[PDB]
Every structure is written in C-alpha cells, then in structure tokens.
Amino acid sequence: GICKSSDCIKSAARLIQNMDATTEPCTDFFKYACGGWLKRNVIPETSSRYGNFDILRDELEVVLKDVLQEPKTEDIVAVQKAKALYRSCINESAIDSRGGEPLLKLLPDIYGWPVATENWEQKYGASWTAEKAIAQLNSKYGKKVLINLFVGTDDKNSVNHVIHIDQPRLGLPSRDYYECTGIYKEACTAYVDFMISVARLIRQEERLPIDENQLALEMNKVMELEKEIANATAKPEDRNDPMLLYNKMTLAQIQNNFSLEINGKPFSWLNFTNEIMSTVNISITNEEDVVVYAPEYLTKLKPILTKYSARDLQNLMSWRFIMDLVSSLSRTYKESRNAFRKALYGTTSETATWRRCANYVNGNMENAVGRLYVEAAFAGESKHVVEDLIAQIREVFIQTLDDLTWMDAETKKRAEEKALAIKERIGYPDDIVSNDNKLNNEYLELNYKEDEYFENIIQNLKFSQSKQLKKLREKVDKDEWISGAAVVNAFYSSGRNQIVFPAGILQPPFFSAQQSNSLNYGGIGMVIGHEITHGFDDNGRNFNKDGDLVDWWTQQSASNFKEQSQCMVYQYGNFSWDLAGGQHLNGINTLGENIADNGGLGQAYRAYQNYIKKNGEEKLLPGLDLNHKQLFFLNFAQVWCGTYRPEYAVNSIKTDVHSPGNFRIIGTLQNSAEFSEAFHCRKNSYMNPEKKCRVW
Ligand SMILES: *[C@@H]1O[C@H](CO)[C@@H](O)[C@H](O)[C@H]1NC(C)=O
Ligand SMILES: *[C@@H]1O[C@H](CO)[C@@H](O)[C@H](O)[C@H]1NC(C)=O
Ligand SMILES: *[C@@H]1O[C@H](CO)[C@@H](O)[C@H](O)[C@H]1NC(C)=O
Ligand SMILES: *[C@@H]1O[C@H](CO)[C@@H](O)[C@H](O)[C@H]1NC(C)=O
Ligand SMILES: [Zn+2]
C-alpha cells in the first residue's frame, strides 16, 4: 500500500534528505524539517541568504541563460531584443573598455556631481533650482530623491491614477542604519568609503587632482545630510495604516501647508510638478488633486533644507543615482561596489555576470522572457490543476467565516463579498505566447545596441518612467499582470483584489500534478491561502472588493481584528534571532505576512481534509514513517528551509516584511492545533504552547 511511482520517489528523497529525524518535531520543527538541509549546505559567497526559494531561483536563472544565449531563426522581434539586451550585458570586454565614460557623458544632464566637478557653482550652480534638479532625475531617470513624487493608483478610486508625494527611499537599507553605531557602524563606514572611492575614480578619469581630505570632507557632509533626511522619514510602523496614510489635497493646499526654502529660493510645488509632468506633455494647475503620504516628512524637511547649499544637495542627489549605475560600468568601478556590498550584505563575491544579466533582462522584459521561460520549462496543463485548488481554498476561506466568533454578521457578509470577487492569475498570460503583435508592441520603442549596455539601461530607465508618468490621465488596465511568469514568488494586489501565481512557483516542492496531494496542499495550497489572506490582513482588510480603500468593517469587528492580531504581534516580537545577534523580530512590521502565514496554512489544511473526505487516503510515501497529515506539515516547513548571513539577518529584521523562514515555521505551527495533533505533541511542549494566536 505504498506509492512507488517516480514522482513519489523524487519527493520522498527530497523530504528525507532535508529533514533531521533525530530532532523531536515537538521541540523544534524547524530543525526536524530542515536540519539535514542545513548540515549539507553553506551559503554561497555570492548570496546573503540561501534555502529552498533561493535554490529554485538559481535554477530558474539557469533556464533563463539557456533560452537567452542562443538566437533562433523563428525569433520574433520582442525576443530578438531580449537576447540582444542579454548579449550587451554579458560582454564585459566592451563594457570594460569604456571605463566610466558612459557615466561621465551622463553627469551634465543631471546638474553634475559637485565633488567630481571643477567649478560646479559656476557651471551648474548658476541656473540650479531644486525644482529643476529633483525633477530631472525623477522624470528622465526614474530616480526619486529628497521629495518622492510619483504617478500611482488612487487608493480610494482604484481605476484612476493620481499624483502622490511621499518620503524618499534612502541609500542604506533602512532609517535605522543612520544611527551608525554598533551593528550599523561598519555599514555607515563602508557607505561613505563607497562614495569617496567612486568620487576618486571619476576625478581620476576626468584627470582632476585628488585631495583625499577634501573628498572625505564633502562625502561626510553627504552622509550628514542624509542622516537628517533619514531621521525625518516616518517609521514603517507609522505607515502601516492605509486609512491614515491617505491624505488627498490640492496642489494649492500643498503650497500653503508645506512651504520649503531650498538654496534660498522659495520652492514652487506647481513648477516642480510641471517640470516633471511636462516631460510627457501634461500640464498641471494648482487645483490638481495629490495624495500626500508623508505630510509630517515634508514639514520636518523645512528646517533641514535651509541649512544646505545647492552644492550639498546635488552631491547627495547625484550620488544616489550614481550608486545605482556603478554595476553597469567597468570592473574598476564595480570593485568599489563589491567592497560596499561585502560590508553591507556579507557577500565576498559578485554574482556571476550571466546571472545578473539574465535577471536584468527578466526584470525589464518580463513578458518576453516569460514567453521563453514557459515554453522551455512550464507544463501548461497544470494551469488547470492549480485553478481547481484555488477554487477549493477560496471556498474554505468563505466557509470559515461562519465559525469565526470575533466578527458580526454584516462584516462577515462583506468579507464573503470581497473573497468572491478575488481575481486569480495562474502561470502566465496566454497572449504572451499566442499574440506576437501585442508582445512586439510592448517593446516597440526600445532598440538595443549590442556594444552599448550602459546606453541600453538608460533607455530602459527613460522608457519606463515616461510610461508611468503618462498614466496620470489614463484608467488602470485590468488585464495587466502584476508579475512576469519567470518568477519564484506569489503575490496579492489590494488595488486590483487579485492573487497571482507565476509559473516559476508552480513546481516542486510547492506543486506538481504528479506528487502527493498532501504535498501540494502543504506547499502551493498554503501559498494560495497566504495570498488570499492578504486581502484580509492589517492592510488588505481596508480595501473592498473593487480594490478601493473604504471601511467595510463595523467598529466592533475592526476592534476585534486588532485584538486577535495583537496576539501575533507579541508572539513574533518575542522571537530572538541568533543569526541577528539575539535581536528581536519586529512583530508589527511582519504582522501582515504572519497573518497570511497562519491563515493560509489553516485554509490549506482544511481543504486537504475536505479532499480526503471526498476522495480517501493517499498511498503513503516510501522510506518515510509519516502519514499524509504529517507530510502536509513537513512539506510546508520544507518550503521555508534556509539560512542567512549575519550581516543580512540584521538587514532583513528592519527591511523584510516577512518573518525569517525558521520563525514562519515555528510561529505558525505553534499556533496550529492541527499540527500538534498530527505529531502527538505534549501540552506546553515548545511547538505546542497552550496560548495560540488565531485571526483567520
Ligand atoms: C564584445 O564587444 C566587442 C566590441 O564591440 C566585440 O569586438 C566582441 O566581438 C563582442 N563579443 C561578443 C562575444 O559579442
Ligand atoms: C530626529 O528628529 C526629531 C524631530 O523630528 C528630533 O527630536 C530628534 O532629536 C532627531 N534625531 C536625531 C538623531 O537628531
Ligand atoms: C519653472 O521655473 C523656472 C524658473 O526657475 C522656469 O525657468 C521654468 O520655465 C519653469 N518650468 C515650468 C514647467 O513651469
Ligand atoms: C512578549 O510577550 C509579552 C506578553 O505576551 C508582551 O507583553 C511583550 O510586549 C512581548 N514582547 C515584544 C518585544 O513584543
Ligand atoms: Zn505575503
């Protein structure tokens, strides 16, 4: 009575190899499920993290290399362009012989980099305004510094686009780094050293004299300014309520409420916005509505920006852009970035050039690369099997509403309405394979030169930003996918109320049409429930069935949501991570993902029990003394096997909205009675605490 198929054999071998059966599952299910994987594996020198997800992504890059590196006679133009882009990227000889010349050509167009410019004040500081300098980086290169203005979806009218104003992203991974002490000290040192090294290279290439003390002076003031910006930004915990974050006002009101004096000139918000929007021939008057996400930031900015000159600001502004471009330059320039990445992420080697290039082409031509990927690597008939599993789990979500005791009836009815409305996107959009005209037209305005990698990447920057700006007066395309197909991930879009399962994640261990259903439900089923539950977490619950930010909760039910989810805030905030030197997880910043994990696993498990009821027990797996309820949880845990470099562990505690895999495993299983039943865990053993958190 044992499954002896090839697909059961490959699954069982993977399960056996990764687990450590000498650990008791009720004491540490992470080491039980992953201890064998941890023993066999070391983090690659090129990675700051390693594990199941990272391995599948590495294996996906291999497929990408295979399809991009050989031209074929039948290739449509969209495909010719992806392969040409790839070839331009991996030609290090062409890149190396240009040195930094492609950046030197570019710098005048952004008002220069003062530290690497002689007589900057005379050349650029003469006509320099904050309106023009910020807008130029924004509109031409998509780089948003000091004031982050972007065109996006209106949270309260999800079919329209609207201009937003927000705080900018920083050079270091989070605002916490700018304390620059203890665990952040080496990163801060490496960051300013990075600045200095790139300034030195540019000056050396321009044949300017190198004054090390003056380099240190100017770049430490860049850091001093950015420390102020960082401290003025709101924390993630003060941005996690989308009802509070949304503030719509007119441009007239913005001028009245957020005045700025920069380089001694009164900042004209209308002139700044028009410097950007004129790029795509759109005129803006002072009655324009604008969603301001960071009003407090703009307020604290006022005393900051009176203290700095045009030259101080431009040294930061140009550096933030140059930082993003160094990896498209010669090996000498990359060597300065390699040094900063080591200090920051703990890697000791740069990622293989072909891998970086494959990922770059994938990120910029997601539909063309997706077509090549699915034709080489994706079954196709599995699209329908996954369809049916989503059907089952969505229904499990709706049925569970009845049993929840902390919602009232009106709110349950609105929750059911939203769940029924979720659109699902599985695998890939069929027309990337069958509609050559549409695919070619997506890249029609791009033309790549095979010896001009830098020119090619600048073209992608311009083309993407101009396309985004042009959406201001257009409706949202409901047919658009929020991810390419060649992606090992899954997503939920609150604005579109849509779950997406790219083909890259529809493979073992998550899913195979020939592996045991216990594994599929513990793998892709739990992921399906995770993404559905995102529509109902501390962010998604605020958006209705059409993706509009509208309150559909009664006061009591909303209050009870907060009560139930507070349990998980304490639970995960109490986890100490050794890899991060004992620092605690942020239970607030990871709450949404933790809610999705705990809700998703329960929905998947109940769907699997339904499956057993309607179909009977599955054949056991050879070589494993586990029943299928145990295998369900074993496979769920093995999805998250992995480990982290110390440097990246402290990074991810501040920047990752997810818990680390090993606490996703321990936390959710601690909260699951069904897990402790499956493994006969004694009361109050580590994996089975008496107090258990439950939202969905
Ligand atoms: C790389 O570019 C150089 C300069 O154009 C060219 O001579 C060489 O053939 C290219 N190499 C490949 C493999 O295309
Ligand atoms: C950050 O700014 C706040 C007010 O915005 C101020 O109270 C605090 O001292 C600043 N922090 C540092 C490190 O300067
Ligand atoms: C913005 O103001 C500058 C003066 O600093 C002016 O030269 C420019 O034409 C204005 N641009 C727009 C789009 O209003
Ligand atoms: C740990 O849990 C206790 C009680 O459950 C809670 O009061 C405390 O705030 C938690 N600690 C953190 C850092 O979340
Ligand atoms: Zn998630």
Output the DSSP codes for 322-337: HHHHGGGS-HHHHHHH
Catalytic annotation, pick one of 275, 548, 597, 656? 597
Q: After which residues does the chain have a break in its backbone, defined as C to next N over 2.5 Å?
A: none
Burial degree of 58 (CB within 10 A; 0-12, 13-18, 19+) = middle
**Angle, vertex CA 423, rays to CA 59 and CA 522, nearest 5:** 50
C-alpha 91 to ligand 1 mean position (Å): 6
Burial degree of 181 (CB within 10 A; 0-12, 13-18, 19+) = exposed
Both structure tokens of 513: 């049409």
Q: Which residues contact 213 (CB under 8 A, 6 or more apart)?
A: none
Reference 274, options 293, 290, 298; nearest CA is 290
CA dist 299 and 165 (Å) reads 13
The response to whether residue 576 sits with its C-beta less than 6 Å from ligand 4 reads no
- Annotated binding-site residues for Zn(2+) read 530, 534, 593
Reference 25, options 687, 689, 642; nearest CA is 687
Closest residue CA from atom 13 of ligand 4 = 573
Q: Chain centroid to CA 397: how far?
A: 26
Closest atom of ligand 3 to 278 CA is 13
CA dist 480 and 44 (Å) reads 36
Q: Which long-range contacts (CB under 8 A, 24 or more apart) does 348-352 make?
A: 348/45, 349/45, 349/46, 350/46, 351/46, 352/46
Whether the Cβ atoms of residue 294 and residue 165 lie closer than 8 Å to each other: yes
Q: Which ligand is nearest to the CA of 450?
A: 1
Name the structure determination technique. X-ray
For a ligand 1 pocket test, name from 91, 330, 455 the mutation site with the most ligand atoms within 8 angstroms of its C-beta.
91
Q: Which residues contact 61 (CB under 8 A, 6 or more apart)?
A: 355, 358, 359
Reference 464, options 568, 587, 360; nearest CA is 360
> Could you say which DSSP state residue 282 is in?
-
Closest residue CA from atom 4 of ligand 4 = 570
Residue whose token pair is 């007239």: 252
CA dist 116 and 197 (Å) reads 11
Residue 597 known to be catalytic: yes
> Could you say which DSSP state residue 154 is in?
E
Helix or strand run (H / E) with residue 262: strand 261-262
Whether the Cβ atoms of residue 589 and residue 655 lie closer than 8 Å to each other: no
The response to whether residue 279 sits with its C-beta less than 6 Å from ligand 3 reads no
Number of H helices, E strands in the chain: 31, 11
Q: Which residues contact 684 (CB under 8 A, 6 or more apart)?
A: 690
Whether the Cβ atoms of residue 183 and residue 335 lie closer than 8 Å to each other: no
Closest residue CA from atom 7 of ligand 2 = 231
For a ligand 3 pocket test, name from 271, 281, 283 the mutation site with the most ligand atoms within 8 angstroms of its C-beta.
271
In Å, how far are 171, 178, 179, 233, 605 from 228, measured between CA atoms? 13, 9, 11, 9, 49
- Annotated binding-site residues for a peptide read 49
Both structure tokens of 583: 């620092």
C-alpha 97 to ligand 1 mean position (Å): 11
CA dist 445 and 580 (Å) reads 46
Whether the Cβ atoms of residue 26 and residue 678 lie closer than 8 Å to each other: no
The domain over range 51-377+430-476 is classified in CATH as 3.40.470.10: no
Both structure tokens of 71: 């031209």
C-alpha 677 to ligand 1 mean position (Å): 63
CA dist 370 and 432 (Å) reads 8
C-alpha 531 to ligand 5 mean position (Å): 6
Both structure tokens of 437: 């005209």
Beta bridge partners of 165: 149, 292
Q: Chain centroid to CA 442: how far?
A: 23
Cα torsion at 631, 634, 635, 640 (round to 10°)?
Answer: 170
Q: Chain centroid to CA 325: how far?
A: 20
Beta bridge partners of 154: 157
C-alpha 626 to ligand 5 mean position (Å): 29
Query: In this structure, what are the phi and psi dihedrals at residue 425, rounded to the nearest 5 degrees?
Result: -130, 120
The response to whether residue 278 sits with its C-beta less than 6 Å from ligand 3 reads yes
Q: Chain centroid to CA 436: how far?
A: 29
Whether the Cβ atoms of residue 188 and residue 668 lie closer than 8 Å to each other: no
Q: Which ligand is nearest to the CA of 279?
A: 3
CA dist 313 and 305 (Å) reads 9
Reference 625, options 5, 25, 6, 38; nearest CA is 25
Residue whose token pair is 């304490």: 570
For a ligand 1 pocket test, name from 70, 451, 456 the mutation site with the most ligand atoms within 8 angstroms of its C-beta.
451
- Annotated binding-site residues read 49, 530, 534, 593
CA dist 639 and 524 (Å) reads 9
Both structure tokens of 331: 């090996």
Domains of the chain by residue range? 1-50+378-429+477-696, 51-377+430-476
CA dist 315 and 349 (Å) reads 29
Closest atom of ligand 2 to 300 CA is 5
CA dist 349 and 605 (Å) reads 42
CA dist 526 and 601 (Å) reads 5
Whether the Cβ atoms of residue 1 and residue 508 lie closer than 8 Å to each other: no
CA dist 204 and 197 (Å) reads 10
CA dist 589 and 592 (Å) reads 7
CA dist 579 and 618 (Å) reads 39
The domain over range 1-50+378-429+477-696 is classified in CATH as 3.40.50.970: no
Reading across the β-sheet that carries 248-250, which strands appear in turn? 148-154, 157-166, 289-292, 248-250
The response to whether residue 302 sits with its C-beta less than 6 Å from ligand 2 reads no
344-365 burial, b at 16+ Cβ within 10 Å, e below that, comes to bbbbeebbeebbbbbbbbbebb
Both structure tokens of 535: 């529509």
For a ligand 4 pocket test, name from 563, 570, 590, 594 the mutation site with the most ligand atoms within 8 angstroms of its C-beta.
570
Question: Are β-strands 248-250 and 289-292 bridged in parallel, bridged antiparallel, or unpaired?
Answer: antiparallel
Both structure tokens of 433: 């394979």
Q: Which residues contact 350 (CB under 8 A, 6 or more apart)?
A: 46, 334, 338, 341
Whether the Cβ atoms of residue 569 and residue 696 lie closer than 8 Å to each other: no
Both structure tokens of 494: 């609150």
In Å, how far are 167, 175, 224, 319, 321 from 180, measured between CA atoms? 21, 10, 11, 19, 22
Reference 502, options 426, 391, 422; nearest CA is 426
Q: For residue 168, give the 3-state DSSP assignment.
A: coil
C-alpha 135 to ligand 3 mean position (Å): 11
> Could you say which DSSP state residue 521 is in?
I
H-only helix segments in 69-171: 77-90, 92-97, 101-106, 120-123, 130-141
Query: Which residues does a 6 A CB cutoff place in the pocket of ligand 1?
Result: 87, 91, 93-94, 451
Q: For residue 686, give the 3-state DSSP assignment.
A: coil
Closest residue CA from atom 11 of ligand 1 = 91
The response to whether residue 300 sits with its C-beta less than 6 Å from ligand 2 reads yes
Both structure tokens of 648: 């990246």
Residue 617 known to be catalytic: no
Whether the Cβ atoms of residue 46 and residue 636 lie closer than 8 Å to each other: no
223: amino acid identity, one letter = M
Beta bridge partners of 492: 499
Q: Specify the resolution in Å.
A: 1.9
CA dist 84 and 100 (Å) reads 22
